[PDB]
């Protein structure tokens, strides 16, 4: 049951995102600012749901995983920059939808694909220069159990305590509080414009489309919160006082708190793209 769903959340996201990414790299019609962002999102999503995975689970379950110094560092670095770049991709998508629906005339002067590729390049550069400390990312060789004493524990230490507290404050504030507030204000302005528009007349299909976009928008914001807040709260917990937290979230609870963060990779290409009008346009091409 447990392991069954731990595998199904891998399957039902890897297959979906592979189908989406091939449908969107094959078609030469999808080359546009409104789908290059979703393509980069799918790339980061597949990297996430391939890296932070039973690579995490089998350790968290059997207490042992045979990596080395230079094998845990790069694993944690990739599975962290995937998260950072997915967050920033969602922020970029929101900031372009704001300009599309709220600044509709002065948008397309800068809705060029030049600007799309510039934003994506700057986004991945900022991701790899903000999630930088792979050399501090490490592996604690001391034991974890009685049988097979030669165990291994990976974790990020950042030797002095004040430094790790300040750095996790920085990470929490500029990966879940500035993205949070900014995406919330952007989608809130979009929702406010569309809601004023709905309530002016208050073309039924137009109003239905507007209401459905508003529901998808609030679902997206609430799932952003619901599938990122747990692990960042736990990170701030470990930052301020590692004691009384590792006593609680030791083996099993953090399994579920991490499980509630890979279903975000499961959801993103099932709500953004799989549930719009584009999948028929793609299946008419792949068939």
């Amino acid at each position: 049951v447990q392991i069954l769903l731990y595998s199904l959340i891998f399957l039902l996201s890897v297959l979906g995102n592979t189908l989406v990414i091939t449908v969107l790299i094959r078609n030469k019609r999808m080359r546009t600012v409104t789908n290059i962002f979703l393509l980069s999102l799918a790339v980061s999503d597949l990297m996430l749901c391939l890296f932070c995975m039973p690579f995490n689970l089998i350790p968290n379950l059997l207490k042992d995983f045979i990596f080395g110094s230079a094998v845990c560092k790069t694993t944690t670095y990739f599975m962290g920059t995937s998260v950072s770049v997915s967050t920033f991709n969602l922020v970029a998508i929101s900031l372009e939808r704001y300009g599309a629906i709220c600044k509709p005339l002065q948008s397309r002067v800068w809705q060029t694909k030049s600007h799309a590729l510039k934003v994506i390049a700057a986004t991945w550069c900022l991701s790899f220069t903000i999630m930088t400390p792979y050399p501090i990312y490490s592996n604690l060789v001391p034991f974890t159990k009685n049988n097979n004493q030669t165990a291994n524990m990976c974790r990020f230490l950042l030797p002095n305590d004040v430094m790790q507290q300040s750095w996790h404050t920085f990470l929490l504030l500029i990966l879940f509080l500035i993205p949070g507030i900014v995406m919330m204000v952007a989608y809130g302005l979009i929702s406010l414009e569309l809601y004023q528009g709905i309530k002016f007349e208050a073309s039924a299909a137009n109003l239905m489309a507007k209401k459905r976009v508003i529901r998808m928008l609030i679902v997206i914001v609430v799932l952003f919160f619901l599938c990122w807040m747990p692990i960042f709260s736990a990170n701030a917990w470990r930052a301020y006082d590692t004691a009384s937290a590792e006593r609680r979230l030791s083996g099993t609870p953090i399994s579920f708190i991490l499980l509630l963060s890979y279903t975000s990779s499961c959801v993103n290409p099932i709500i953004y793209c799989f549930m719009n009008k584009r999948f028929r346009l793609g299946f008419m091409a792949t068939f």
């Binding site: 932070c52 944690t76 599975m79 159990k145 974790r155 692990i231 736990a234 990170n235 083996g251 991490l258």
Partner: peptide, 8 residues
């Protein structure tokens, strides 16, 4: 003595 939760 497994207390790590690694990262996200």
């Amino acid at each position: 003595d497994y207390m790590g939760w690694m990262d996200f």
